[PDB]
Amino acid sequence: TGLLDGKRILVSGIITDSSIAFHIARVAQEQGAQLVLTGFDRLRLIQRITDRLPAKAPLLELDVQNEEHLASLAGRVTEAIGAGNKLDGVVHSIGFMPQTGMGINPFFDAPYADVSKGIHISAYSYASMAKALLPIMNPGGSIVGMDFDPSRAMPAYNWMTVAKSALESVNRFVAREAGKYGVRSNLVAAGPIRTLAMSAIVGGALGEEAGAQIQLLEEGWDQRAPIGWNMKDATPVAKTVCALLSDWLPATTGDIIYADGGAHTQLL
Amino acid sequence: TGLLDGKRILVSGIITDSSIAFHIARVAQEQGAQLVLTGFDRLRLIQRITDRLPAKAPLLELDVQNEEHLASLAGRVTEAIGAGNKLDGVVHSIGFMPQTGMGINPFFDAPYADVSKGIHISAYSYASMAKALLPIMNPGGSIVGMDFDPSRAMPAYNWMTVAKSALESVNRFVAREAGKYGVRSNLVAAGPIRTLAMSAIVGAGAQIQLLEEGWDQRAPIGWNMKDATPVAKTVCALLSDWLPATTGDIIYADGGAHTQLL
Amino acid sequence: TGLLDGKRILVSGIITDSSIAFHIARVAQEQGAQLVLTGFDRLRLIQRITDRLPAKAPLLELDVQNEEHLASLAGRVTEAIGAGNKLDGVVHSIGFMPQTGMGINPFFDAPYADVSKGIHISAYSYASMAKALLPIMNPGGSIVGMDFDPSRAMPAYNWMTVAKSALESVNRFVAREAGKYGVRSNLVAAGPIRTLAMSAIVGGALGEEAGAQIQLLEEGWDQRAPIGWNMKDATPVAKTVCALLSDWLPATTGDIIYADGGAHTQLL
Amino acid sequence: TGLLDGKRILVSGIITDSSIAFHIARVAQEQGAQLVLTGFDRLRLIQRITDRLPAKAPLLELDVQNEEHLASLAGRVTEAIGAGNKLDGVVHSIGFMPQTGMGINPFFDAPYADVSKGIHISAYSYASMAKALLPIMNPGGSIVGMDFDPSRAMPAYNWMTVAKSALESVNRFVAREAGKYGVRSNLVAAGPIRTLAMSAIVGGALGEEAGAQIQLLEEGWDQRAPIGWNMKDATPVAKTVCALLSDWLPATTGDIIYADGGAHTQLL
Numbered sequence A, C, D: 001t002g003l004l005d006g007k008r009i010l011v012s013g014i015i016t017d018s019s020i021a022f023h024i025a026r027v028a029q030e031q032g033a034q035l036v037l038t039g040f041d042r043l044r045l046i047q048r049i050t051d052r053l054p055a056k057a058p059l060l061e062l063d064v065q066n067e068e069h070l071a072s073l074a075g076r077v078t079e080a081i082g083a084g085n086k087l088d089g090v091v092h093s094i095g096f097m098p099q100t101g102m103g104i105n106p107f108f109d110a111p112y113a114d115v116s117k118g119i120h121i122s123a124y125s126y127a128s129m130a131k132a133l134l135p136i137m138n139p140g141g142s143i144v145g146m147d148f149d150p151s152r153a154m155p156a157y158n159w160m161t162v163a164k165s166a167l168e169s170v171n172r173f174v175a176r177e178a179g180k181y182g183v184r185s186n187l188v189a190a191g192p193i194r195t196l197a198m199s200a201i202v203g204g205a206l207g208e209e210a211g212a213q214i215q216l217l218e219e220g221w222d223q224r225a226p227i228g229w230n231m232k233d234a235t236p237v238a239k240t241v242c243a244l245l246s247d248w249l250p251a252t253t254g255d256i257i258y259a260d261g262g263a264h265t266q267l268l
Numbered sequence B: 001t002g003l004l005d006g007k008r009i010l011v012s013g014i015i016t017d018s019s020i021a022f023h024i025a026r027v028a029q030e031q032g033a034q035l036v037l038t039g040f041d042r043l044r045l046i047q048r049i050t051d052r053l054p055a056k057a058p059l060l061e062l063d064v065q066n067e068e069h070l071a072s073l074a075g076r077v078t079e080a081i082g083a084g085n086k087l088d089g090v091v092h093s094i095g096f097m098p099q100t101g102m103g104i105n106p107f108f109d110a111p112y113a114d115v116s117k118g119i120h121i122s123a124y125s126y127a128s129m130a131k132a133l134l135p136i137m138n139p140g141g142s143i144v145g146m147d148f149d150p151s152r153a154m155p156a157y158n159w160m161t162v163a164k165s166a167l168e169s170v171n172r173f174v175a176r177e178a179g180k181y182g183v184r185s186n187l188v189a190a191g192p193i194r195t196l197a198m199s200a201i202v203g204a205g206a207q208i209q210l211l212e213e214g215w216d217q218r219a220p221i222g223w224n225m226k227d228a229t230p231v232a233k234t235v236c237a238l239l240s241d242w243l244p245a246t247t248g249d250i251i252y253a254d255g256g257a258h259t260q261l262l
């Protein structure tokens, strides 16, 4: 019946009901998955948000910079999905970059302490989550992270672009470790979706250029995509993540699937 | 409910029951699709082979070098699936290269007449099929072709490598046309599978060893050249509604080999 | 001492004094190369054009669709440069696509006979020239062809894009053969330059939409290039080809060097 | 010759006479460049080493983690080359990764503090150097860094691979800043060269897996390269960096040139 019937999937990265992770979780539950959710910092807000999902799911705290949270994560997941069950899926939908690393702030003025924090959250944590969770994943399972194509430089995305390049490389190594467990690791490179991070982090760092943000995104994506691109509709991205979590891409690992309307295949 | 429940899908390229297309068709029928099949040249053999599929499907003749076959194709499909119905999917699983263009024959000795024939069948025909079939495809539909990663040169594959590079470029243009109909176009770059065409590339022990080095040894999840199922499933994923934002693109069903250097 | 002092280099593809090959030849002679030139079809015009180069160079006829021309080419080159001498460099600066394959003509309406002719001239001939000339090339030598980045689809370039993809693949195979002779094979992917083919083939196939060419070129190149791009100045492209012909890129083969102002490294 | 006649070029990264930077410096001086050298930590040893170069050059201290060193660098360079003169070239040939991040140590066991240190030295510093030096670079100048192709995962290189992916992304941003000064930024992705850092990837020349290292390098490079690859010969790499420092690749920026015998263009 549903694409993910019977699968136990962890989903990180929900902060609002616009979050990519919110929509991944919604679609996964519509397709019969049983979820465990993780959230950072504003756990009361996150709980109110996840109440809007179609089904209850337990919520665990995870700040990927906190060693204790990572060291206790598998134990807390095992208790949430029922002792002795394992995960079939893990979704990393997590990122951060300080303001100095984005927007109109000059590229060269971001101090390394800020850039390092962003790389820790946005790239290294894909490895740390895999490390914590692989021992409790079933053969045939799937780890998925969110990418935004960093193969070319661009306005404003700045040091987050560098973090995404690092993430891509990390994914290919995670795939080598995950393969010993019969598990796949892949990224979904999504087109732009209107999320809290889009507005507050990228749009914030733009200051008076945020009108231009929309136009840049329409030029980069909707205009180039042969099938178009709607930044207000996260469903196509969520579906693509669900396809990777399913049994229907069983020979794809260390890889990147582009859910961007085909924009990255067209020059203009 | 199967993945392709209710979808009408054309599948080209069956010649034996090892054909990638045979397995694509098998999996698609297991997932509820209704098929129309096309075959080239050995139509009696192909009919015996397609009898082994889990369900009957009509078989139509198509030689992609034949203009008349392409010009009548939509009409013949429409008659097989019923007036008023359209296709949701098309699978291009077709290739050819003359012997001069592959194997131990020197790269520089393949005459252009042979290379041109191979490119016609293996790359241009992806466009010609799209052209013939897009007018009878539903919005939301999907065209999928088969690729073998040509981004780096390699022994023996020779001018077929060039044909695949051409096919990749063709796919990106087909995507622009197909988008006007609400249709996606993508290729699946599969790892090696033991098919009739594989055994024609050369005529052997060295071929298998190179394929093991290039694929199974590099793939984090391994690669089994006797098992077409993972490739077939990947094609079915592209035919489904579960990759709705992917077009002009290439999905690698190769065990992750192409992501690993050694 | 010029960069190519003492080198014997064949340069194909001169048709006017705007031709990329004209500028390659000019720069190569300024850098001390002795040239052999090849031309197609309008040999009287081409001779008047090559008289404007800074030094005399013999001109040979070569239509790359003519088997007899390819089979006699080595012998005719050897007679021009003298028995006992060999070539150090070969430049392929040749292309064609019939009108049905370009512009506003629908992509799907190009018959294969037209596409095949374009692929023959634009891609296969890179192999056929290498095959004819490698037996009279010195170790350390260099074959260079001209590319236009076909990694993504775009308006108007249509089937020429497909021919360039084929050429890239061909270059990697030519490199394998050329390596047995100690010879490198590479392409230069140039940004747009105002040439007869740009205007009459690409621009002509746009009919009343020719303004669209210039607009797309300005968006794709000058606007994205961190150091800018001037389509009226072939010198930077010519210099880059000369760099490949020299001994200063001795470890680069089967490869593509981008002389495009860095445009292809930038998204917008 | 004189490829770099009259150019003032800064070269970082010499520690022994096997260092890639040593050979970059040697070739650059053979081609008429006037050098300023920078060295980290062992400045007396480095001075004995740089005495073996064909000409004297001043040596300045630079630890790229030290803010004071970066803030004073332009002033110290200007004093060495003379007030009123500027640099035409900068070479970044610097890297580091702690032992936990490389070799047989499990990928998942490298702590982020170690990985961050490596990324700081190996990737962020490319930006920090550009920031310090662009204000004293002439139009037409060139910044070059060293890369090792990280587009696919591989044994042992582990987190250094991730650092190189980050460096590639950094280079494309540096190119956007450098373009405002008329300056190019590019990386050279070199094939393997036997240096001190090479041996440290597996914990020393008699590291546990050193036999496996040699075999993997022969398979990855010399066996795939159409023109071969010799890991004892840094000259082809040095020449390629000099090509980028010269005026002969004037339209290439934000980019990567592969000096690896063409290995990366061949599958097997």
Ligand SMILES: NC(=O)c1ccc[n+]([C@@H]2O[C@H](COP(=O)([O-])OP(=O)(O)OC[C@H]3O[C@@H](n4cnc5c(N)ncnc54)[C@H](O)[C@@H]3O)[C@@H](O)[C@H]2O)c1
Pocket: A012, A013, A014, A015, A016, A018, A019, A020, A021, A039, A040, A062, A063, A064, A065, A092, A093, A094, A095, A096, A121, A146, A147, A148, A189, A190, A191, A192, A193, A194, A195, A196, A197, A198
């Ligand atoms: N929105 C886009 O256009 C777009 C496109 C492609 C990729 N992405 C990526 O998708 C992912 C989700 O971002 P989003 O757009 O949905 O935005 P978002 O703001 O909804 O979610 C980002 C999440 O990261 C979490 N996070 C930050 N610091 C963390 C920490 N220390 N520990 C754990 N979690 C932490 C936040 O709590 C939040 O839930 C990210 O990887 C982002 O880069 C976004």
Ligand SMILES: NC(=O)c1ccc[n+]([C@@H]2O[C@H](COP(=O)([O-])OP(=O)(O)OC[C@H]3O[C@@H](n4cnc5c(N)ncnc54)[C@H](O)[C@@H]3O)[C@@H](O)[C@H]2O)c1
Pocket: B012, B013, B014, B015, B016, B018, B019, B020, B021, B039, B040, B062, B063, B064, B065, B092, B093, B094, B095, B096, B121, B146, B147, B148, B189, B190, B191, B192, B193, B194, B195, B196, B197, B198
């Ligand atoms: N087997 C592999 O390892 C592998 C890997 C990647 C991609 N592929 C691709 O998968 C596709 C199917 O190949 P396969 O390996 O299943 O081999 P195969 O021998 O089963 O099938 C090839 C098919 O091409 C058809 N064909 C040839 N000329 C034709 C023409 N003029 N008109 C119509 N059909 C024609 C044949 O009739 C046959 O059905 C091809 O595109 C091939 O290049 C194969």
Ligand SMILES: NC(=O)c1ccc[n+]([C@@H]2O[C@H](COP(=O)([O-])OP(=O)(O)OC[C@H]3O[C@@H](n4cnc5c(N)ncnc54)[C@H](O)[C@@H]3O)[C@@H](O)[C@H]2O)c1
Pocket: C012, C013, C014, C015, C016, C018, C019, C020, C021, C039, C040, C062, C063, C064, C065, C092, C093, C094, C095, C096, C121, C146, C147, C148, C189, C190, C191, C192, C193, C194, C195, C196, C197, C198
């Ligand atoms: N002009 C650009 O913007 C640009 C950019 C990138 C690459 N290129 C490529 O550079 C090369 C040169 O084109 P150009 O722009 O200088 O144009 P051009 O019109 O100056 O030169 C094209 C050349 O192709 C030759 N040619 C065509 N058919 C031939 C045949 N049968 N045999 C031999 N020669 C034949 C013509 O005689 C002519 O000399 C081509 O490969 C073109 O694709 C051009």
Ligand SMILES: NC(=O)c1ccc[n+]([C@@H]2O[C@H](COP(=O)([O-])OP(=O)(O)OC[C@H]3O[C@@H](n4cnc5c(N)ncnc54)[C@H](O)[C@@H]3O)[C@@H](O)[C@H]2O)c1
Pocket: D012, D013, D014, D015, D016, D018, D019, D020, D021, D039, D040, D062, D063, D064, D065, D092, D093, D094, D095, D096, D121, D146, D147, D148, D189, D190, D191, D192, D193, D194, D195, D196, D197, D198
């Ligand atoms: N050797 C190879 O096979 C190879 C191949 C491709 C790329 N590379 C790259 O070439 C570059 C040079 O490495 P190599 O092989 O010549 O090794 P090496 O050990 O000779 O040189 C590395 C240099 O990095 C310097 N360095 C380290 N920490 C520093 C700091 N805090 N501040 C400033 N400098 C610092 C060291 O002092 C040393 O001079 C690196 O970027 C390396 O990754 C090496």
Ligand SMILES: Cc1ccccc1Oc1ccc(Cn2cc(-c3ccccc3)nn2)cc1O
Pocket: A094, A095, A096, A097, A147, A148, A154, A155, A156, A157, A160, A191, A192, A193, A195, A197, A198, A201, A202, A213, A216, A217, A220
């Ligand atoms: C979680 C998180 C933390 C830190 C940074 C981002 C982030 O999440 C993302 C949010 C939006 C995007 C998409 N996007 C790009 C841009 C930009 C300016 C416009 C021009 C084109 C580049 N604007 N919108 C990508 C993301 O990774």
Ligand SMILES: Cc1ccccc1Oc1ccc(Cn2cc(-c3ccccc3)nn2)cc1O
Pocket: B094, B095, B096, B097, B147, B148, B154, B155, B156, B157, B160, B191, B192, B193, B195, B197, B198, B201, B207, B210, B211, B214
């Ligand atoms: C249909 C068709 C017509 C013409 C040619 C091929 C073909 O179909 C294929 C069959 C098998 C493969 C995979 N493959 C590659 C090789 C080779 C030698 C070994 C090293 C790696 C290159 N051997 N097996 C690829 C195909 O495209």
Ligand SMILES: Cc1ccccc1Oc1ccc(Cn2cc(-c3ccccc3)nn2)cc1O
Pocket: C094, C095, C096, C097, C147, C148, C154, C155, C156, C157, C160, C191, C192, C193, C195, C197, C198, C201, C202, C212, C213, C214, C216, C217, C220
């Ligand atoms: C020799 C030859 C034969 C046949 C065709 C071209 C050709 O030579 C070239 C001439 C110009 C270019 C550059 N270019 C591209 C375009 C187009 C519209 C604008 C957007 C980008 C695609 N317009 N200008 C590239 C070439 O290869």
Ligand SMILES: Cc1ccccc1Oc1ccc(Cn2cc(-c3ccccc3)nn2)cc1O
Pocket: D094, D095, D096, D097, D147, D148, D154, D155, D156, D157, D160, D191, D192, D193, D195, D197, D198, D201, D213, D216, D217, D220
């Ligand atoms: C400076 C520095 C700091 C930290 C790490 C490296 C480094 O510098 C390099 C030294 C040598 C290489 C080349 N290389 C790779 C490998 C490896 C094992 C063999 C298989 C292929 C991956 N072994 N040799 C690359 C470098 O970046």
Ligand SMILES: [Cl-]
Pocket: A235, A236, A239, B244
């Ligand atoms: Cl959707």
